From Swiss-Prot:
Annotated function: Cytoplasmic dynein 1 acts as a motor for the intracellular retrograde motility of vesicles and organelles along microtubules. Dynein has ATPase activity; the force-producing power stroke is thought to occur on release of ADP. Plays a role in mitotic spindle assembly and metaphase plate congression.
Disease named in the record: Charcot-Marie-Tooth disease, axonal, type 2O: An axonal form of Charcot-Marie-Tooth disease, a disorder of the peripheral nervous system, characterized by progressive weakness and atrophy, initially of the peroneal muscles and later of the distal muscles of the arms. Charcot-Marie-Tooth disease is classified in two main groups on the basis of electrophysiologic properties and histopathology: primary peripheral demyelinating neuropathies (designated CMT1 when they are dominantly inherited) and primary peripheral axonal neuropathies (CMT2).
Location(s), subcellular: Cytoplasm, Cytoskeleton
Protein name: Cytoplasmic dynein 1 heavy chain 1
The organism's taxonomic lineage, starting at the top: Eukaryota, Metazoa, Chordata, Craniata, Vertebrata
Assembly and interaction partners: Homodimer. The cytoplasmic dynein 1 complex consists of two catalytic heavy chains (HCs) and a number of non-catalytic subunits presented by intermediate chains (ICs), light intermediate chains (LICs) and light chains (LCs); the composition seems to vary in respect to the IC, LIC and LC composition. The heavy chain homodimer serves as a scaffold for the probable homodimeric assembly of the respective non-catalytic subunits. The ICs and LICs bind directly to the HC dimer and dynein LCs assemble on the IC dimer. Interacts with DYNC1LI1; DYNC1LI1 and DYNC1LI2 bind mutually exclusive to DYNC1H1.
Notes concerning its domains: Dynein heavy chains probably consist of an N-terminal stem (which binds cargo and interacts with other dynein components), and the head or motor domain. The motor contains six tandemly-linked AAA domains in the head, which form a ring. A stalk-like structure (formed by two of the coiled coil domains) protrudes between AAA 4 and AAA 5 and terminates in a microtubule-binding site. A seventh domain may also contribute to this ring; it is not clear whether the N-terminus or the C-terminus forms this extra domain.
Family in the record: Belongs to the dynein heavy chain family.
Length: 58
C-alpha cells in the first residue's frame, strides 16, 4: 500500500543491526521492486514442480 521502508537514521553499526532485527518479518516481493504477484507466480511454479516430481514418483 502506501507504506514504504524507511532507512535508519543511526550512524553506528549497532543501530543498523537493531533496525534489521526490527524488520517487520512479513517480506513481500514488492520489497525488491517486483510486483506483488511474483510470489504467486513462484508458488505456482513450485506447485507444478511438486506435481511433476510426484508424477515421476509413479
Amino acid at each position: 500500500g502506501h507504506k514504504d521502508i524507511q532507512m535508519p537514521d543511526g550512524i553506528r553499526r549497532e543501530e543498523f543491526v537493531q533496525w534489521v532485527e526490527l524488520l517487520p518479518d512479513t517480506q513481500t516481493p514488492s520489497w525488491l521492486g517486483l510486483p506483488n504477484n511474483a510470489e504467486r507466480v513462484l508458488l505456482t511454479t513450485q506447485g507444478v514442480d511438486m506435481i511433476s516430481k510426484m508424477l515421476k514418483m509413479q
